Symmetry: C3
Subunit: 174 residues, 3 copies
């Protein structure tokens, strides 16, 4: 059975990310550049903060015909006390992509499948669709609220940005 889970990842310019480690001999990103990162994570209904993403983007090549970059990513999605999701695959700054679910822990132990990566605003808003298989349980009501249709002007609920209890999960990751 497939449980579709969607979140919103936003860089609110407060976690020192992304951090650029420059090695390519070019004013544009190129192989050599490494970009560690860590942004916040809010539920798909934008009412709650669940955790953060954490990981590493490796630059593969700038794509000028597409006015964009090519990173190879391996990173996690943290959902507080519930557990986390890990992924591996392509992140194209210019289009939408699909990454592999390499596994999970917690309520996400044994997770597999693919996850959709939709950009919205570069480099601050991305929407994801986890076509999640492998879990032993139905997901938490607080993580499955009807998603908010993605667009450039989406904003987490004021309470979630404000970290008020109603807008967060227990031990939300920060």
């Amino acid at each position: 059975k497939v449980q579709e889970l969607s979140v919103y990842e936003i860089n609110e310019l407060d976690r020192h990310s992304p951090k650029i480690l420059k090695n390519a001999f070019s004013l544009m990103f190129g192989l050599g550049d490494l970009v560690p990162f860590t942004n916040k994570l809010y539920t798909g209904d934008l009412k709650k903060r669940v955790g953060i993403t954490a990981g590493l983007c490796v630059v593969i090549e700038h794509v000028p015909e597409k006015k964009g970059e090519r990173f190879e990513a391996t990173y996690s999605f943290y959902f507080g006390d519930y557990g986390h999701l890990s992924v591996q695959g392509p992140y194209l700054t210019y289009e939408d992509s699909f990454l592999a679910i390499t596994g999970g822990a917690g309520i996400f132990e044994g997770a597999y499948g693919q996850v959709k990566l939709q950009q919205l605003v570069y480099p601050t808003k991305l929407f994801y669709t986890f076509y999640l298989k492998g879990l032993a349980n139905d997901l938490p009501l607080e993580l499955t609220g009807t998603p908010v249709p993605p667009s450039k002007d989406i904003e987490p609920a004021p309470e979630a940005k404000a970290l008020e209890p109603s807008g967060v999960i227990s031990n939300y990751t920060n």
Copy 2:
């Protein structure tokens, strides 16, 4: 059911790859050294260019008794519109190894298993064999032709290096 898939990885020196981020205080490779890389990927029968490899090699330690290096490599294999497989494991410059497949996306969504890595020319020609498990369907007939005899002399079909229609899969990754 286990499906077997074999491709050839070739460094044709046109992707600026690999990049050596030398950090170990030796002329030899050692821990601290990181190598982002991306080579070309061709079908096992070498008839069609399907895509590239892309990711990172982490130097673990040089191996004196073997005239070689032990890397811990995390990267993916991109097959154009078909999708991709992610992987994690040991790359030994002096011997063949098996790297674990961590997941896939597209026709490889749900993939799991292991892959053998054979180095034909260090480090410009490589030959793998995935033992793919988990695929919902049978592999595209165009991906599973008899391969070419592993050797330091292998070369892609002319139509494939030339990127002619009959030498490439649709939207082969680049």
Copy 3:
């Protein structure tokens, strides 16, 4: 079914590890800092040397309240001829956590599940409890001896520190 497999990762400091790539804005650890690493691995009963751990620790943030760091880790455990296991998990130097099992090779082909990481002595002794699913068979007996309850004063048996035959598996990884 789950096949619990515990192991000890002893850092005896003879592998130039942890190498520290210090790039963060801050003096203490922070995003940007990278720590490639490799330690020794022993069986749960500390009677045998099986091989090594190899991979990368990416710093996500310093956690001052906890006088410790948050890392996002992607590494592999090597068990000689039995193969290896790979992972993606949060490493928090100040508290136990769980890692996703991204896969395995050799006898570990098909591996999935989660692993509990318990640090016993920072940064030297660590203890893992892998709730290991998917394997084809029961694990070989050499790897399933009764594990030693964790403690900050544990040390591997003598036979193994010395790499004597009765203390190592065949072709243990180094």
